[PDB]
Structures are given as C-alpha cells and as structure tokens.
Design a protein around this nucleic acid. Structure first.
Lengths: 79, 97, 106, 94, 92, 108, 81, 91
DNA sequence: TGCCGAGGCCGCTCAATTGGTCGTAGACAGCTCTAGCACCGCTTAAACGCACGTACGCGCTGTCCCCCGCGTTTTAACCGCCAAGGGGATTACTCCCTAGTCTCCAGGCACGTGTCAGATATATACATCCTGTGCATGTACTCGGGATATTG
DNA sequence: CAATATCCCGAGTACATGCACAGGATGTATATATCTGACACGTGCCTGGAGACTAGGGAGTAATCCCCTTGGCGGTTAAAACGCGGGGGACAGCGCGTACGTGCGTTTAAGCGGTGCTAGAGCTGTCTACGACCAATTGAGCGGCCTCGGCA
C-alpha cells in the first residue's frame, strides 16, 4: 500500500530538522497516521473548490485556498 | 574507529536544520495524494504544481509537530520521543480529541 | 499632462490600483479617496520592514539576490513581526537552527 | 490574457533601501503573496467597522483603526504615523 | 425604534420537535447568537467563492458549496439533502 | 391582487425567507443575491435549530425539568461529536462545564 | 488604581482550578496564574477600547468587548453578536 | 485521606456560578483599561461579558495544564506545566 | 496427659448521598395589540449567467541507470522500577475584612431628530504606466584539493 | 596522538536577471449630481457615588504525612556501520480540458401600491423552579459470642 512509501528514514529526516535526537520504533507507524489524516482534511476542501467550478483538475490555487481555509496558509504559490 | 551513539544524531540535526530541501521522495508522495483523492472524486487530474504545494505544506506540518513533540519528551525527563508524546502535543493543540 | 496620485502622496506603490481593489470589497457602497493614501503606506512600510531587515541577512552571508531561505531566517526571528505572519509558511524556506540544551552532550 | 501583480513596486522599494541588491524569482512569489495577504486582511476587516457603526463608506479614519487592530506592538505605531504623512501630502495638493 | 431578532423562529422550531418544552430567556440569547453566527459564516464563504470564480451573483450553488466546506461531517450531507428539498418545493 | 403567500410557506420552511434575502444583500457580498439562494439558506440554518434543539430538550427531559436553561445547551453543543466541531469557537455564557475526573487521580 | 490584581485571592484561583479537574496545586501556581490573567485582560480590553474610540463613545459597551473577543478566535455567546 | 480535595471537584463541576468575586474583578478591569485611555465608563454588561470569558479561558487552561502533570507521572500541577501548555498552544 | 491465649463470627450507631415533600416569587407564555414597516404582487428594462464551438497547452503514459532504502547485529546508554528521605501542600480552626444588598441622589452622555453641503459616484475623452516578450552576461552553483577543528 | 569530518578557496559554466521594447487598457481630467453623514440640539437612561448592615468568605496559624525527588539497578531496544537490493529520478507523443468567443434568454432590481407578519408593550397572572426540610439507605467500625493451636 502506497502510504508505506513514507519510508522510515524520511520520517527520521523530518524529525531531525525538528531537532529530536532519538526515535522510538513506535513513532514510524504512528506518524503516518497524522500525515494521512492531514492530507485527508485538505484534499476534501481542494476537491470541493474544484467541483464548485466544474473543472476536473486540481490546481495549485485550489490547494492554496484549502490550506488558507484551515489556518495553515502558504506564501509561495499565489496569495 | 567508530563514534559514540549520540554523535551522529547531533551531526544530522546540524545538517537537516541548515538545508531547506524537500525530505520525502517525490513519486512516493505523489502516489499517496492520488490514492487519498480518488476516494472522494473518481478520475481526477492534478496540475504538476498542485502536488508540490501539498508537499511543501505537509513537510512544514510534520516538522512543526515534531518540534512541539520534543518539548513534551524533554519535559518528561526523557530525550527519546514515543507515541505517548505526540498524543499529548496533538491534544493540547486541539486536533484529535 | 496627467499627474499620478502616487506622486501626490509620495509613495512608490499604486494608489489608484488600490481604490479600484477596495471598490470590489465594499458591501454595496463607496470608498473615500483619502483611504487609498492611508491604505497604501500601510502596505508599503511593511515592505521596508520585511525587506530592509534582510540587511541583517543577505549582506551578512556575502551573497547578492534575496532568496526564499531568507525572509525565513528573519521574519521568524524579529518579533514585533512574526505575529503578522504566523498564519504563513514560506515555501522553500526551511527553519532556524536550534538544538535544545538537554540533547547536546553534557 | 494578462495578470496584475505587485511585482514592480516591491522591486522599486527594494532599490530604495538596498541599492546594490536584487531579489530572486522564487522570492518575488512570496513578497507578492505577503502583500496580497495583508491587503485582503485590511480590506476584508475594514468592511466590518462599517457594519458595526452602520456607515456606508470606507474612509481614512476607518482604515486607521483596521491597522491598529491587525498590527502588533510598535509596528502599529509606525504604520499609523507613516500613512498619516501620506494623507497629509495628498490633501495639500488634491 | 424596532430592534429585530430571530427569537420567534427558534421558538416556533422548538414546538416542532418538543411540543411540551420551553426556553428560559437567558437560554434564548444563545440561540439568537448561534443562529446569526452560522448566517455570517455562510455569507462570508459564499461571497469569497463568487469572487475566486469572478462571478457577480450568488446562486444556490454558490451557497451549497459554502455549506459543504463549512459543516463538519454527516451535518454536511444532511444539510445539503435538506436545502435541496426547499428550493425544489419553492420552484413549483 | 390574489392575496399573498409568504416565501417561507411556499418553500416549506419556518424560517423567514424574505428577511434573510434582505440580510444577504447588504452583507459583505457581491452585487447580485439570487432569490433561490435565500431558500437553500433558511433551510441550512433551520436544520441546525432542529438537529441542535432535538437533542437538547432530549436532555432537559432527563433532568426532569420543563424549560431549557442554559447548561442544557453546553451538555449537547459540547457533547455531540459533530456539534463539538461546528461550535469550537463558542463559550456558552453561564453554560458551566462537562463533568469529568481524570481516571488516574481516583485512588485504589 | 493601586494593586488590584491581588484581588484575585488565592482561594478563587483554587476554585477555578477545582472546576478544571486538578487535585494538587503547588504554591507557585498562584503568582503564575495572576500573570496569565493580566496578560489576557490587556490583550482583549485594548481591542475593546479601539472599537470604542472608533465610535467616539466614552462608555465601553458589551458589543465592543464581544467584537474584541470575536476576532481572537474566542467568540462568546450570551451578550449578542 | 486525600478525599475532600476530590469532593470539591464534584461540587464545582456541577455548579455554573462565576467563581471570582465580582467587585475585585471589576476594579482590576478598570485598572487595566486606564493605560489605554483615561476616564472610560464601563457599561454594566461589558464587565460581566469580560468575566464570563476570563473564567472560561482560565478553566480551559487548567484542563489543558493537568494533562501535562499526568504526562510527567505527577499529580501536582506546577508552573512548568502552565508554561508547557501555553508554549505548545502558541500563546 | 492437661492448659488457656489467640483467632474467627454477629448486632449498635455515626455520616455521606439520594430520593422525597412544601410553599412563596419571580419569569415564562399567553393575549392585544393596531400602530406600523416591511414582505408581497405587478409592471418594466437590462445585467449577467449558461451553454455551445474550437484552439492548442500541458498532464498522463512509455522508455532507460544510479542513490537510496532494506536487511544484520553488536553493543551501548536509556527507560524503567523501586526504595527511602524531607518538607511543602493540606486540613481544621478562630478571627477578621469586606463583598453583597437596598437605598438615596445627580448629572454624563447615549441616544435619536432636524439641516444642508461636502463628498464620492458616474460619463466621456485621452495619454502614459505595465504587461508580455526577446535578449547578453554576471551570479551562484557544483566540483576538487588542502587546511583547520574535534572526536575518541 | 589518529582519524573522519567540516570548512574554505579557486575554476569553469548552464542558466536566471534585469533590461529595452511595442503597445494597450485603465488611471486621470473636467463636469454634473444626489444623498450620506457632520453638526446642533434636545430628552432620558443609567453609569456612578456615598451610607449602613449582615454574614459569607478570606487570612493566618499549627500540626502531619503525602508526595516529589534523588540513587542505584537490570535489561531491552536503539544507534552506527556495513553490505545488498530494488526502485527514484532523468527521457518523447496524444489527446483531453482549460481557456477564450459568441450568443440567447433566465432572472434580479427598481418603483409603486396595500395590509399582516411581527415586536413593544401590560404589572397581566399564573405555575415552574428554588430554596428549605425530611426520611432511607448504604457503609464501617467497634463492642459482644464461640473453637481452636501452641504451651505447662
């Protein structure tokens, strides 16, 4: 399944940027849980703004507006 | 010759805390956002730059969750992070319970 | 010869492109001309705090051309600001270095 | 087709404050976005002071109050001064 | 001069679901606040939706989307199924 | 001149379709509030005042009292799983708190 | 005014604590919690006075403080708006 | 032993009264506003609407603070827990 | 043999919770407003939405070769338990300050109405600021070789 | 002291900036218009102040034992490094959809005329709910009965 491609060393890199020294082996399968739910919650909104406008490709602006709605704004792709 | 356990973990902090590059592989994350999407609307298409704005937002969320998690482990006398730490951080920020 | 309203305020930013923007966010009613000249110069003036505080960064690294690993490594370091931009991640901006005092060797 | 952005004004301000310097095409995306975001906060919030007082028209004294709700600390005290100068120059020439 | 409130429609709806029951005045102010908070959130989101798509009007779909963003869960698919009764009856 | 039949009764709703149309126009909206979009909005307002009163009197009954005082809101609005998400932002004045002792602080 | 934050007397902080579900309160919680409450009051009454100054009123009114709360993500139901 | 402190929990989680004395809180809010402007007058309902929001913030913070004391295997809450609950919350 | 203290079963009686019965005072729900201001119905002109056509951008899909992730395993230092020691958080009590109520009395100023001019909208004509485009060359990069720093 | 590593400096260069250019669409001018709201002016609510009294609560003290913290431990579960494996990241062609143009006509707004849905009342006038008092029950420990195990 495609979620297992968020590989163990990738979680370690993300964690290392965040500043943690030593990682329990239970954190790998638990962290995937929080990434999987976070993507679920912004893709619902991005596909909602898509279905509204009748087009059927998700644009960068759609994921920008979805992220903006939930208080997790990004400057980068179009404010 | 071989370093002490601990030496290389602090070497990695000073590396990945100085670069700004993306940490998850492209294709494996691109497969994941397609699978989560097709459960809500069949036969989507994504613009090439939409999935990038997903990735740059995800990494910046994960990295923030760990930064707030380590604060819990440090408070609880440990240095190792464990699931019980994430469940505390994520409850005070009001996400899950 | 037409003047421009930017010059009468003394501003670099477009005082009449604003006004037209505000007139599209307005209930069903109008917007005073003296609003564009205190709307602008309170959008300029964040520039020359967002840019400007990069004196403390770009020049210090001996590199020309502001790039996204700056603004980050500044906007999240000066702290009268930060509050204005908490709501925003900077794409391709990384994070400031730390390491907490209990993880480093004792 | 064509799009409007603040791309030229930020460069024109950059050259006012760091003459030797420039700014990447990746960094322009950010600045243009920061400028849009602060604009939409001020303009979107200014509508509400017009509702709360049941006034029709958006006005300088109204915007002045929006940029002391939306700005923290000493940053507000400077923006409020700077914009007042700009209006005083405009109204002295019309 | 008149002050205007939703106070009668919440009472009318209470007698729809609990015919014996009532509300204290202090517990009316809660509904009279709540019901206009959800008004504003729908108006504000529907307004932005029209703007992003550079429309001027706000037809039914400009609101059905604003409800399908703003409501959390089963409440979205219920409220959408409820509002599509109302307009379907109205247009007869 | 054939009497009148209010837009509420035509829709099938107890909420005021006319009043809400005149509220939407002259909200922070753009310049064209269609009339079918005040019926799909009295509905998706009245539906909460069912789905949130239905369960509240449902608990005034259980405490054996007739009139829904303010805490009976809190004990639903911050107890039903979907309402707790819709109303995160809301403090119910005089509403009290949902009672709970942490399972680790009780002895034996 | 003199020193009126001392009027959040120790027992009252214990009542608030008791509602919140805590058993044992170290003696340093009292002087910390006054610090948290004074910072919260400052950041809401400043907004409430700026809503007042806009309307040329002198009297601060309930809607001013409710609008002040509403913008910080801390909406209050009970006083209108 | 250790039971009467627990008997208070079951009391204050049933009542919905305001827990701070009214006049002492009202005189504090008059103090804090003077450095924003001299000679305000406060409407009698404004002072109440502050109190209702304060108590609801304080008691939310003690709910979120206790969770940290449990995390450290303690029972007693301490300032380092309030500090954590505010830092992780983003105050 | 014996002796006779230690050990194992049944009512009194004080203290929380819980469910029950009384009675006196506001605060809900029901009329009558009725006067009244908005919703509704009936014309109309006109803005803008919806739905074809079709042009051509760019997102999906097939091909080849390296970093990276997967798998091992030793061993180290961390998480874990547990036992003991001190003082600080609680409890119970008496004395004390002052919150809470009612009561009178003043006058700030919230609130709403009446005038009329200062202000911004809307049109037409028009000219110059900005967008998209194509272009040389300088900056910032990736690499290789050696110096300095720091771990074990 | 040896070794792996980070730091640092100069060469060679594929590409992104910052500019000049054509030109187009929107900012600006000059004039006409009307209605929002600034200014003046009352009326009246109510924010405030000062008094006296009862009694709920807070303050300060004394005794104690519950908890927090430090120390020492035995063990498992991570970090490091190596060796091996598979799969990410770098490459042209189709045709599907976003995007722009043209056109029809559904539908909202604006003005007007008429009357009922709705909101400030009365001091309504009951009748829920709030204190205030009451009776049952559970729970627990202590003071009285009867058999047996270890001791003379």
């Amino acid at each position: 399944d495609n979620i297992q491609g968020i590989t163990k060393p990738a979680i370690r890199r993300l964690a290392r940027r965040g500043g943690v020294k030593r990682i329990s082996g239970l954190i790998y399968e638990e962290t995937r849980g929080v990434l999987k739910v976070f993507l679920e919650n912004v893709i619902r909104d991005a596909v909602t703004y898509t279905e509204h406008a009748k087009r059927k490709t998700v644009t960068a602006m759609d994921v920008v507006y979805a992220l903006k709605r939930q208080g997790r704004t990004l400057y980068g792709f179009g404010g | 010759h071989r370093y002490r356990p601990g030496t290389v973990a602090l070497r990695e902090i000073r590396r990945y805390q100085k670069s700004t590059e993306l940490l998850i592989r492209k294709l494996p994350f691109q497969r994941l956002v397609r699978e989560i999407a097709q459960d809500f609307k069949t036969d989507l298409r994504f613009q090439s730059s939409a999935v990038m704005a997903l990735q740059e937002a995800c990494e910046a969320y994960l990295v923030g969750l760990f930064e707030d998690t380590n604060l819990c482990a440090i408070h609880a006398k440990r240095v190792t992070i464990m699931p019980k730490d994430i469940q505390l951080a994520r409850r005070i920020r009001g996400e899950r319970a | 010869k037409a003047v421009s309203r930017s010059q009468r305020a003394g501003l670099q930013f477009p005082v009449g492109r604003i006004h037209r923007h505000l007139k599209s966010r307005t209930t069903s009613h109008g917007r005073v001309g003296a609003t564009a000249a205190v709307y602008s110069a309170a959008i300029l003036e964040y520039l020359t705090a967002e840019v400007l505080e990069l004196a403390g960064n770009a020049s210090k690294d001996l590199k020309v051309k502001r790039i996204t690993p700056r603004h980050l490594q500044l906007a999240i370091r000066g702290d009268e600001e930060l509050d204005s931009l908490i709501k925003a991640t900077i794409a391709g901006g990384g994070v400031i270095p730390h390491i907490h005092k209990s993880l480093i060797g004792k | 087709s064509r799009k409007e952005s603040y791309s030229i004004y930020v460069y024109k301000v950059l050259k006012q404050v760091h003459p030797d310097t420039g700014i990447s095409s990746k960094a322009m995306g950010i600045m243009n976005s920061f400028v849009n975001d602060i604009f939409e906060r001020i303009a979107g919030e200014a509508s509400r002071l017009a509702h709360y007082n049941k006034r029709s028209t958006i006005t300088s004294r109204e915007i002045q109050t929006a940029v002391r709700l939306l700005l923290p600390g000493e940053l507000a005290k400077h923006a409020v001064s700077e914009g007042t100068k700009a209006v005083t120059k405009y109204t002295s020439s019309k």
